[PDB]
PDB file of N, CA, C and O in Angstrom:
ATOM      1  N   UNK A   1       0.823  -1.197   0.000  1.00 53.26           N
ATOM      2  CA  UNK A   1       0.000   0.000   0.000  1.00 53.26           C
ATOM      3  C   UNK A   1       0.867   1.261   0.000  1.00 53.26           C
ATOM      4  O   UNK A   1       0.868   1.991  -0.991  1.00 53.26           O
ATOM      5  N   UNK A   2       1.637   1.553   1.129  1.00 52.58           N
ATOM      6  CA  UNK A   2       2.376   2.927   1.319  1.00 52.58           C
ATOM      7  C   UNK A   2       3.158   1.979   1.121  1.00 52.58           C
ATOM      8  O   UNK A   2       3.429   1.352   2.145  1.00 52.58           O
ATOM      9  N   UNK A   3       3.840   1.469  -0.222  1.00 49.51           N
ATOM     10  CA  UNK A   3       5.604   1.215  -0.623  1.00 49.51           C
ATOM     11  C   UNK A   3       5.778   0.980  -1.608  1.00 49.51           C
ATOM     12  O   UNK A   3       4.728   1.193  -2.213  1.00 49.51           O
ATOM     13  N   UNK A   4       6.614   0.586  -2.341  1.00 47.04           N
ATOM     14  CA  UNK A   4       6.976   0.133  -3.823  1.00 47.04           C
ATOM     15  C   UNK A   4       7.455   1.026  -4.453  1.00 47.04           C
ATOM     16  O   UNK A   4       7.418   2.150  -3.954  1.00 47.04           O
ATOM     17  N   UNK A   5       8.060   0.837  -5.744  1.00 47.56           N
ATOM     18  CA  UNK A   5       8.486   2.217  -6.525  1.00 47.56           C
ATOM     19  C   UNK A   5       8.680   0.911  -8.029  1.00 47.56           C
ATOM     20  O   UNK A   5       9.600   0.917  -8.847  1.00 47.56           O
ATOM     21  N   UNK A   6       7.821   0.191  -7.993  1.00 49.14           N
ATOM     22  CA  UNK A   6       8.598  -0.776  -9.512  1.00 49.14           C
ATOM     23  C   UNK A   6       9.931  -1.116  -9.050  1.00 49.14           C
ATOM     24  O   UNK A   6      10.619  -0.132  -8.779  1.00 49.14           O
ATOM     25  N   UNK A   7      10.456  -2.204  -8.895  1.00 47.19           N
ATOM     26  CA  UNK A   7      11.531  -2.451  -9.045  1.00 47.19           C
ATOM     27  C   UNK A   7      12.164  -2.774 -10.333  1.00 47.19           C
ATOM     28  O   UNK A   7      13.365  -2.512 -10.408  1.00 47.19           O
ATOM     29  N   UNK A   8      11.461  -3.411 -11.598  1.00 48.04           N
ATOM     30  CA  UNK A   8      11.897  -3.474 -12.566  1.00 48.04           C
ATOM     31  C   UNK A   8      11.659  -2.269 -13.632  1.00 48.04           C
ATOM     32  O   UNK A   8      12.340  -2.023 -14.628  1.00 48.04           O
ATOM     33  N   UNK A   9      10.697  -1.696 -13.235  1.00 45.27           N
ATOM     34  CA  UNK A   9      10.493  -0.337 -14.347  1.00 45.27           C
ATOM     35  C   UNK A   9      12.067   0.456 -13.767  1.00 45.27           C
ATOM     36  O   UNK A   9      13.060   0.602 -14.480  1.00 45.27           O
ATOM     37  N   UNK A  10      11.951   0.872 -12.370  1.00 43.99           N
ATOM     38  CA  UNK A  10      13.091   1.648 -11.972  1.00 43.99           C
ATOM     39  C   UNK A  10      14.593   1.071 -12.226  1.00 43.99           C
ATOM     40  O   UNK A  10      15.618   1.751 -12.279  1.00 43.99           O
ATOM     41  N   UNK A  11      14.454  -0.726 -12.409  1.00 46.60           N
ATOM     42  CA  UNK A  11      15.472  -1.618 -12.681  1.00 46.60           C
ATOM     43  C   UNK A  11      15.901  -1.044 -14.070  1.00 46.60           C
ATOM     44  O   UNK A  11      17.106  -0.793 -14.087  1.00 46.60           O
ATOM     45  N   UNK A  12      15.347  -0.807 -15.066  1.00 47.26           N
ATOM     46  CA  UNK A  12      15.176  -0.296 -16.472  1.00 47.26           C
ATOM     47  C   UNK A  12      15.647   0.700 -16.777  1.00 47.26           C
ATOM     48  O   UNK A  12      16.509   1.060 -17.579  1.00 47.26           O
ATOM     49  N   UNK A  13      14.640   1.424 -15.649  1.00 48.80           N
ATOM     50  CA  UNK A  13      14.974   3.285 -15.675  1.00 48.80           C
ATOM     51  C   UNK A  13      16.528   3.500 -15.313  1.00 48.80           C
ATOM     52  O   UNK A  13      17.146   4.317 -15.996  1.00 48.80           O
ATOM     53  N   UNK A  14      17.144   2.871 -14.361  1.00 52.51           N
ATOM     54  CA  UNK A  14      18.561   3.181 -13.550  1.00 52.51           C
ATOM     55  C   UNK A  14      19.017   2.789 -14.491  1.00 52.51           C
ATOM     56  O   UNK A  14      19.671   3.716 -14.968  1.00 52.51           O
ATOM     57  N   UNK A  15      19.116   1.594 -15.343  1.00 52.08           N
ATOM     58  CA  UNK A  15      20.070   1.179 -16.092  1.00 52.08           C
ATOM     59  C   UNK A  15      20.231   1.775 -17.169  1.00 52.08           C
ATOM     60  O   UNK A  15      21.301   2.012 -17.731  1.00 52.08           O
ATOM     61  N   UNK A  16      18.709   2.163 -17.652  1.00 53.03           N
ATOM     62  CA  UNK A  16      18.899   2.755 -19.153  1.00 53.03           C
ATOM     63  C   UNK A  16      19.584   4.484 -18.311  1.00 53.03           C
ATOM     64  O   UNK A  16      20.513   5.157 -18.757  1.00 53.03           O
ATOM     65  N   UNK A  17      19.056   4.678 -17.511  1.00 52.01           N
ATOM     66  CA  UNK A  17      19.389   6.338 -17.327  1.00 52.01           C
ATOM     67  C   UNK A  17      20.676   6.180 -17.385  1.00 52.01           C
ATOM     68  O   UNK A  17      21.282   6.889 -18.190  1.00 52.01           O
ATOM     69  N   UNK A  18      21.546   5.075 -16.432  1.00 55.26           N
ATOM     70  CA  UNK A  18      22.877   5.422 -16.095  1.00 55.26           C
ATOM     71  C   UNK A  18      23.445   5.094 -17.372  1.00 55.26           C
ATOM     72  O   UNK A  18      24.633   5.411 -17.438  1.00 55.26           O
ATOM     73  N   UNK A  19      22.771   4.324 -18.869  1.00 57.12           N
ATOM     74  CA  UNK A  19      24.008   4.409 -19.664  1.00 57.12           C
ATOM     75  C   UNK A  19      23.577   5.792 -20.528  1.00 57.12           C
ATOM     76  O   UNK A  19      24.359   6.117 -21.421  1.00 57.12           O
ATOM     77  N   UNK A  20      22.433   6.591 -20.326  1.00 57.98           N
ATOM     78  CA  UNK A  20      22.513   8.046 -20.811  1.00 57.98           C
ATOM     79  C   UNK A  20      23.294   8.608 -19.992  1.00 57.98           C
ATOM     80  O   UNK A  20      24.186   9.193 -20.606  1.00 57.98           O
ATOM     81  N   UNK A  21      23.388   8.716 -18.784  1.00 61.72           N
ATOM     82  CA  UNK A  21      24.404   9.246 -17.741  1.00 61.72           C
ATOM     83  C   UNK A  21      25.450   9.161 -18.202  1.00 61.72           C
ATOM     84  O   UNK A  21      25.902  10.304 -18.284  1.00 61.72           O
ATOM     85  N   UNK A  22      26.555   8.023 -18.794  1.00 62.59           N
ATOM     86  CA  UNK A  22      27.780   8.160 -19.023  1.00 62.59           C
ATOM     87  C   UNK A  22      27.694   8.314 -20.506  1.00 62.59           C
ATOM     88  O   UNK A  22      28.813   8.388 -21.014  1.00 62.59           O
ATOM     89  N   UNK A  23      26.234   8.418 -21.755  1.00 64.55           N
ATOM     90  CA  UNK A  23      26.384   8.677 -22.751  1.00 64.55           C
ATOM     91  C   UNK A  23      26.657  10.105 -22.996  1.00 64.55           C
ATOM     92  O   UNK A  23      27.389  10.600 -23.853  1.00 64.55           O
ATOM     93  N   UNK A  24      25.849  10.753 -21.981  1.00 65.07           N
ATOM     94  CA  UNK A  24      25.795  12.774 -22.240  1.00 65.07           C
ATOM     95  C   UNK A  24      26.492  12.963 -21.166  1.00 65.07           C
ATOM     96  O   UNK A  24      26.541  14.124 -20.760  1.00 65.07           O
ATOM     97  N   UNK A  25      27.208  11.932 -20.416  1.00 67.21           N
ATOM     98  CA  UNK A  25      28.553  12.465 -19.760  1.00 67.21           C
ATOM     99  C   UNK A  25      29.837  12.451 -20.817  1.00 67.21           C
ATOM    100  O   UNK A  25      30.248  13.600 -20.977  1.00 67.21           O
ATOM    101  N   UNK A  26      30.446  11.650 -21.440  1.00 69.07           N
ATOM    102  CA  UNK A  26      31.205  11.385 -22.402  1.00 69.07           C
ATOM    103  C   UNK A  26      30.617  12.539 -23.611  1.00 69.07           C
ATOM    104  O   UNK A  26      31.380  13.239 -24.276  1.00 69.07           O
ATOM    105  N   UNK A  27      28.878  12.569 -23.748  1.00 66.79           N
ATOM    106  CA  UNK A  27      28.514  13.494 -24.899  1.00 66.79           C
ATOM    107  C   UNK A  27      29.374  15.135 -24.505  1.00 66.79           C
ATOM    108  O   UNK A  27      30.195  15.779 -25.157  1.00 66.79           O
ATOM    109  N   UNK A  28      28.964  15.295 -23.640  1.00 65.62           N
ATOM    110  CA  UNK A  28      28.916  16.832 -22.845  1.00 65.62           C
ATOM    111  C   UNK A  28      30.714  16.548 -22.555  1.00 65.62           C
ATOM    112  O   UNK A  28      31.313  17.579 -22.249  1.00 65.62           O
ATOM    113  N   UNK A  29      31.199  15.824 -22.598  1.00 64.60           N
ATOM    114  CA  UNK A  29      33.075  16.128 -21.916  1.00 64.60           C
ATOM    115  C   UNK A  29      33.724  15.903 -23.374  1.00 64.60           C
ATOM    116  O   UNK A  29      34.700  16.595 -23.664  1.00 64.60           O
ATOM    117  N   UNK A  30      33.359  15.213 -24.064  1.00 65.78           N
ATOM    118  CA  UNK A  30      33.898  14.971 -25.413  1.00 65.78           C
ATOM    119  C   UNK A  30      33.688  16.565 -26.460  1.00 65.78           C
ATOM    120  O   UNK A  30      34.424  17.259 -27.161  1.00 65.78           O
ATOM    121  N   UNK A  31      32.204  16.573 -26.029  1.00 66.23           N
ATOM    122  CA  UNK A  31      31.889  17.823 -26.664  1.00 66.23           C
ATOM    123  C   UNK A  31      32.325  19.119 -26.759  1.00 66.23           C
ATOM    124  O   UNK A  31      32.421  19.779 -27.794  1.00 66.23           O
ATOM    125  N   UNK A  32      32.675  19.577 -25.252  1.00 67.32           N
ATOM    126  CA  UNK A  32      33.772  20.613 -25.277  1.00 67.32           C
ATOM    127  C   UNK A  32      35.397  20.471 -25.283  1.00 67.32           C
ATOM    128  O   UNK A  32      36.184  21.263 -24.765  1.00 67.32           O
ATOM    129  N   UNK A  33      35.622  19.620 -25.787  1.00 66.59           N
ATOM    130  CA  UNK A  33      36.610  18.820 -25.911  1.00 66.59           C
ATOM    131  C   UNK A  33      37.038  19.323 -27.280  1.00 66.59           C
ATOM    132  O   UNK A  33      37.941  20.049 -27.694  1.00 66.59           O
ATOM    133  N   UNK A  34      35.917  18.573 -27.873  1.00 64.07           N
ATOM    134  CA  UNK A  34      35.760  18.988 -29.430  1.00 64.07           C
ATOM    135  C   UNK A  34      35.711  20.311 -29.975  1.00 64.07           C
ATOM    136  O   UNK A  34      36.294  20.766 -30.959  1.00 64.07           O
ATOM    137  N   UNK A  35      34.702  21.001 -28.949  1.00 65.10           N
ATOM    138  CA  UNK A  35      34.579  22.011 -29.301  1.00 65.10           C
ATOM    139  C   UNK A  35      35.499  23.196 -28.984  1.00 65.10           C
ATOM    140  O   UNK A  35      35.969  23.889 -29.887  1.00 65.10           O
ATOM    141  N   UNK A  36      35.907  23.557 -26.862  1.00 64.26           N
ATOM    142  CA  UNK A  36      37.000  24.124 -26.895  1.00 64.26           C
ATOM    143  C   UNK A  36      37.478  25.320 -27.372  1.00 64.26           C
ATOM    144  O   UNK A  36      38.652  25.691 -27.378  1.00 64.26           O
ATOM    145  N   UNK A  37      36.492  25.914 -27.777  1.00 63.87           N
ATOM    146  CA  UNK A  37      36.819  27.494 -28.776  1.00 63.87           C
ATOM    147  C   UNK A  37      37.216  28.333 -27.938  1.00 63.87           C
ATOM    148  O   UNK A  37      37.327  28.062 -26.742  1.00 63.87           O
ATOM    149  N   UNK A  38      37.671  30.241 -28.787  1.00 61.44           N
ATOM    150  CA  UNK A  38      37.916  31.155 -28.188  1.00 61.44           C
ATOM    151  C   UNK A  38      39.177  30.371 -27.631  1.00 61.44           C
ATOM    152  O   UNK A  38      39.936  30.914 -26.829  1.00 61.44           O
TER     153      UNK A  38
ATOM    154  N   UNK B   1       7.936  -2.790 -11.532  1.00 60.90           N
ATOM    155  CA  UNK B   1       7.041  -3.363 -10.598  1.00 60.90           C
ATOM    156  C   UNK B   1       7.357  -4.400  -9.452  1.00 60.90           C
ATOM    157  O   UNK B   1       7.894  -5.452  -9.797  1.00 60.90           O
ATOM    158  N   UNK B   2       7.135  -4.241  -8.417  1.00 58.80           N
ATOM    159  CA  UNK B   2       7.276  -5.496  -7.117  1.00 58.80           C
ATOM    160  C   UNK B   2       8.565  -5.275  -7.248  1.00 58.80           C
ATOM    161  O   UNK B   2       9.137  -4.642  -8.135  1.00 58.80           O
ATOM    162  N   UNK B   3       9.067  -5.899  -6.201  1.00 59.88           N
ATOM    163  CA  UNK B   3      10.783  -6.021  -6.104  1.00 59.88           C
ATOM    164  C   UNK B   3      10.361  -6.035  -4.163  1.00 59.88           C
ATOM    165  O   UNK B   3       9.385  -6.631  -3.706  1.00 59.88           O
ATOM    166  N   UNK B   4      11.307  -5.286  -3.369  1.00 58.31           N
ATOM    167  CA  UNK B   4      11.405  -5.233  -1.974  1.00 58.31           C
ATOM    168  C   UNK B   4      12.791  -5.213  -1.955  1.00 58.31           C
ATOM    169  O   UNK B   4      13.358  -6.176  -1.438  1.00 58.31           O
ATOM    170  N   UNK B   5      13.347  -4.446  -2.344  1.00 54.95           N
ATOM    171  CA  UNK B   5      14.880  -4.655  -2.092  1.00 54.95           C
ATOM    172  C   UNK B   5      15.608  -3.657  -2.302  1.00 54.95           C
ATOM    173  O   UNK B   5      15.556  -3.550  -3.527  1.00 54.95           O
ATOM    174  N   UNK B   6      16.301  -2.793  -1.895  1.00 51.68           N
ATOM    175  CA  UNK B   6      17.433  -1.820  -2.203  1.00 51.68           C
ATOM    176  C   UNK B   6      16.520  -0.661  -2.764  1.00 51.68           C
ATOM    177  O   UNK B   6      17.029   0.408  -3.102  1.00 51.68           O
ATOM    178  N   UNK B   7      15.062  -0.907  -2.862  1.00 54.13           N
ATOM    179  CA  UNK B   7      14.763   0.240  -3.584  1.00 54.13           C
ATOM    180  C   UNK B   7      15.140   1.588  -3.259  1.00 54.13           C
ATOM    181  O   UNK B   7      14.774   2.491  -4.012  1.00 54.13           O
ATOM    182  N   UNK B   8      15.710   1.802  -2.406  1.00 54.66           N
ATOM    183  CA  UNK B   8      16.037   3.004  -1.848  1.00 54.66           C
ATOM    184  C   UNK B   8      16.964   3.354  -2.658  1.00 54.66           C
ATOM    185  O   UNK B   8      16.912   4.429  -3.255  1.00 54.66           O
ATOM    186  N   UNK B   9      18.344   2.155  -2.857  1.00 55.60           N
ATOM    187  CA  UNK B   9      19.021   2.454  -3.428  1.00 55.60           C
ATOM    188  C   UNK B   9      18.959   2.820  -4.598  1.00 55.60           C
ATOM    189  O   UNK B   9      19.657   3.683  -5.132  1.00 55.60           O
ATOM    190  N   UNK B  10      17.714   1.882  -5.299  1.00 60.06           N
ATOM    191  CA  UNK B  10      17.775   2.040  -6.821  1.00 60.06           C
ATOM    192  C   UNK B  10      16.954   3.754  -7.068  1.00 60.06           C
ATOM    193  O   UNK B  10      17.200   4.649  -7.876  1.00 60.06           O
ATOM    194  N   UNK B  11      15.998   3.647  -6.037  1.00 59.77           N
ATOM    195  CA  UNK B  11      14.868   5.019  -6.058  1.00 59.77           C
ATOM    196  C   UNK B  11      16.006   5.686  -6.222  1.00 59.77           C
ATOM    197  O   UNK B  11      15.830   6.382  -7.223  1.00 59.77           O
ATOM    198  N   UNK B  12      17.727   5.975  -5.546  1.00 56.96           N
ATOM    199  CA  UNK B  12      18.478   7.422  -5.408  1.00 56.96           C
ATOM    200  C   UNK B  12      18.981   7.065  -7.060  1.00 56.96           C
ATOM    201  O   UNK B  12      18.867   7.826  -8.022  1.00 56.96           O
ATOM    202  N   UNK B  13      19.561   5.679  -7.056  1.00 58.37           N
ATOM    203  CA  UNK B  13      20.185   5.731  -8.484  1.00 58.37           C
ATOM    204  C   UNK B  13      19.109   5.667  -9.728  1.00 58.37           C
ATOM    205  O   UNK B  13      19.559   5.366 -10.834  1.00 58.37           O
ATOM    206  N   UNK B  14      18.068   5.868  -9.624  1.00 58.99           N
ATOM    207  CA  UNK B  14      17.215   6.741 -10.785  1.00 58.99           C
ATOM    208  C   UNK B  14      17.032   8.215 -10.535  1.00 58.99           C
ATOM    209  O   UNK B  14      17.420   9.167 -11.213  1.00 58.99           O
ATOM    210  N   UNK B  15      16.305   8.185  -9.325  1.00 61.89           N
ATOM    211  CA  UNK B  15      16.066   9.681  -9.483  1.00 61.89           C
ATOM    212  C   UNK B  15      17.452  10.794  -9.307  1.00 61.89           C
ATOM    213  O   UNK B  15      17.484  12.002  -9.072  1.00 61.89           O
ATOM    214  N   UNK B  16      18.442   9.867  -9.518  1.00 64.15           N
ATOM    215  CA  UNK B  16      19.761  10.979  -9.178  1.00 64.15           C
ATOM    216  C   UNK B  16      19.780  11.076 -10.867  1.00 64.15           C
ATOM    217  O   UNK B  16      19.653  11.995 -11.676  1.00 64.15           O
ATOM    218  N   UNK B  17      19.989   9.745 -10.941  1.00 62.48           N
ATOM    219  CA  UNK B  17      20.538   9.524 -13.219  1.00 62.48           C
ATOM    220  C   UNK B  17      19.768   9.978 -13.569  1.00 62.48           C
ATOM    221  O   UNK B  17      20.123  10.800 -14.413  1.00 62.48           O
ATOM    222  N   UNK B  18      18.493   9.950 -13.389  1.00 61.46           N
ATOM    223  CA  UNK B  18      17.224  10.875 -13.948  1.00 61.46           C
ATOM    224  C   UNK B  18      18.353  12.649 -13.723  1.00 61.46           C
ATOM    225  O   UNK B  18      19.330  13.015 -14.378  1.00 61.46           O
ATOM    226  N   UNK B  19      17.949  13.042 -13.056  1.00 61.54           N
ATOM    227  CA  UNK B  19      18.112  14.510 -12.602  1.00 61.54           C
ATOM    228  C   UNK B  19      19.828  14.787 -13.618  1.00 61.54           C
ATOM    229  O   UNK B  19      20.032  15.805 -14.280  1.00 61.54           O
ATOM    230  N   UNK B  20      20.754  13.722 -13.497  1.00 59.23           N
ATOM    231  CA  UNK B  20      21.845  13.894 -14.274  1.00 59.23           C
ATOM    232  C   UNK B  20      21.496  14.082 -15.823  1.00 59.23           C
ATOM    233  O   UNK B  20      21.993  14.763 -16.721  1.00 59.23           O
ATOM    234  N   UNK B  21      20.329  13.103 -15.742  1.00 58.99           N
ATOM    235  CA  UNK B  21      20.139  12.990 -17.346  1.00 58.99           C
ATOM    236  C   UNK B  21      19.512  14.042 -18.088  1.00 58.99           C
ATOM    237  O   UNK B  21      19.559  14.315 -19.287  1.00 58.99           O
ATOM    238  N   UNK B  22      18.754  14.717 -16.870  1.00 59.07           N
ATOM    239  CA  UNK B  22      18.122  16.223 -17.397  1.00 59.07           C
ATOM    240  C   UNK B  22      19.250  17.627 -17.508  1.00 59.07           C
ATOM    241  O   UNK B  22      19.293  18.678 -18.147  1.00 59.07           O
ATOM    242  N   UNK B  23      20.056  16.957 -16.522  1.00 58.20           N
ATOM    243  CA  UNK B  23      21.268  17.845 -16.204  1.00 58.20           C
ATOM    244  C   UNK B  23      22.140  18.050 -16.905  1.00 58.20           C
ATOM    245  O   UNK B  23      22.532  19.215 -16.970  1.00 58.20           O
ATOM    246  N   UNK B  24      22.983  16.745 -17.934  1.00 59.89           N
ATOM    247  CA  UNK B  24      23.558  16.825 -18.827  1.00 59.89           C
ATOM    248  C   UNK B  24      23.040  17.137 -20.302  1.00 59.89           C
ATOM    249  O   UNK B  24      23.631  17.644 -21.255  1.00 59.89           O
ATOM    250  N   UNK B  25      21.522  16.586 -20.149  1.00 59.56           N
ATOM    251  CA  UNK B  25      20.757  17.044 -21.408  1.00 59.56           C
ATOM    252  C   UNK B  25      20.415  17.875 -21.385  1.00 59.56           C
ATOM    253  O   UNK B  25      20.167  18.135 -22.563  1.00 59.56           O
ATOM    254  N   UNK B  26      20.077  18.909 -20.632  1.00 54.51           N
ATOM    255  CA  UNK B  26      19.530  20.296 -20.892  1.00 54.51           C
ATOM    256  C   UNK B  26      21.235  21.316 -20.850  1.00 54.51           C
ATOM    257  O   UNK B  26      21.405  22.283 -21.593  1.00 54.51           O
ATOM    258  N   UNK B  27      22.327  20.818 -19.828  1.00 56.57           N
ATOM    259  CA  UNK B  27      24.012  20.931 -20.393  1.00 56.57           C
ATOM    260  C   UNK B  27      24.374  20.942 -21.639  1.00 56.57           C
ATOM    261  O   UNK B  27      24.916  21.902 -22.187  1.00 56.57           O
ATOM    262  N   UNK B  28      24.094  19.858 -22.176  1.00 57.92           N
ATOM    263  CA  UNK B  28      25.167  19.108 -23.051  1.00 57.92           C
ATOM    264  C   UNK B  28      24.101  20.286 -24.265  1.00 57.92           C
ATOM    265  O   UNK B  28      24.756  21.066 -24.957  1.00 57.92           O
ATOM    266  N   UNK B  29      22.901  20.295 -24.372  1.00 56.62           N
ATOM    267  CA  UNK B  29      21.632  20.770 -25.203  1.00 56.62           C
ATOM    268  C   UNK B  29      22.239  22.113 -25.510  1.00 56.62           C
ATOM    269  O   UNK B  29      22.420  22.518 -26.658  1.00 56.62           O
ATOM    270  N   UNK B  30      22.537  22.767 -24.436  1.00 58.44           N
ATOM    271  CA  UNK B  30      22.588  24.718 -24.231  1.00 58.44           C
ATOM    272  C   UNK B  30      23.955  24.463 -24.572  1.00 58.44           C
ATOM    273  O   UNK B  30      24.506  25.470 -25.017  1.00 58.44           O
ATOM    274  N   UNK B  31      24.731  23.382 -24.506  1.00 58.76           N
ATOM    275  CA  UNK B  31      26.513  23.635 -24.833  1.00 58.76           C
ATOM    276  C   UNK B  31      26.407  23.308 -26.634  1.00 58.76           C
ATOM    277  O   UNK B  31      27.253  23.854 -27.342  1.00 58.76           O
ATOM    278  N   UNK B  32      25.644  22.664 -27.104  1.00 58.98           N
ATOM    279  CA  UNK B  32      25.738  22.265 -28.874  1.00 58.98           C
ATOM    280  C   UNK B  32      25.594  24.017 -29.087  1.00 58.98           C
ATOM    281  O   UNK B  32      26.395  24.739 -29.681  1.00 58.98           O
ATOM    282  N   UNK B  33      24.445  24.384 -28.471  1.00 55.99           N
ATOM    283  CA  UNK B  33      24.111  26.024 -29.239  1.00 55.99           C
ATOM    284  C   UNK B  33      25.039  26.887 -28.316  1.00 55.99           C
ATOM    285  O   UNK B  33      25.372  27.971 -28.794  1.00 55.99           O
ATOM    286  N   UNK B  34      25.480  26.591 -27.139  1.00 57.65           N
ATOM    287  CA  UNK B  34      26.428  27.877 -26.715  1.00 57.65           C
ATOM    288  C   UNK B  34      27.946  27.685 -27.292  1.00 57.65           C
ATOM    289  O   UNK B  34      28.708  28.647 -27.390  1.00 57.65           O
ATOM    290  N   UNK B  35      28.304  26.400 -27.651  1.00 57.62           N
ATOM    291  CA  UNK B  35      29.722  26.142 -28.346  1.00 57.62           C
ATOM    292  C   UNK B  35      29.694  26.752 -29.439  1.00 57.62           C
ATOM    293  O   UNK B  35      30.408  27.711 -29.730  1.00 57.62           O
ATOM    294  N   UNK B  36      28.191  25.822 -30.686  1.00 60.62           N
ATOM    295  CA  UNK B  36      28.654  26.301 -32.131  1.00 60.62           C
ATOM    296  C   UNK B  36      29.943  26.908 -32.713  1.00 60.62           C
ATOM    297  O   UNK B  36      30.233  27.632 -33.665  1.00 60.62           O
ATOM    298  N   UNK B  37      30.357  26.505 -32.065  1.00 60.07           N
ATOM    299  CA  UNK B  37      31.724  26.726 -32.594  1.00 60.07           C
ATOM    300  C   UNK B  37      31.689  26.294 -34.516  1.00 60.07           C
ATOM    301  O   UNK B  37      30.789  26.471 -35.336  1.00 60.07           O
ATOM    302  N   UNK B  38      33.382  25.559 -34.710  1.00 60.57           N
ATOM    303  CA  UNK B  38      33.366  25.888 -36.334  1.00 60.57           C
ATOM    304  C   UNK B  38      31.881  26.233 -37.173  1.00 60.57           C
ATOM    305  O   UNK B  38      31.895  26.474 -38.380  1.00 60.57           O
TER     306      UNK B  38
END
């Protein structure tokens, strides 16, 4: 009643988030990397 | 759905990667148009 949160939706969510996490981490550090101007 | 386990943990490691993922994407988003560089 008062508990739960999905364990497999959030199982999903953490996993897929954390490989966007190190995708637009690597995106975003590579990027000014790349980019770097001025 | 269902689980009983660590959700705490997993609840911080989504809603943190979540919040990163908005963090680096709305980052990484404002850095493509604030770099534009070449």
């Amino acid at each position: 009643g008062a508990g739960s949160s999905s364990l497999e939706a959030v199982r999903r969510k953490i996993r897929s988030l954390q490989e966007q996490n190190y995708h637009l981490e690597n995106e975003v550090a590579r990027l000014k990397k790349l980019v770097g101007e001025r």
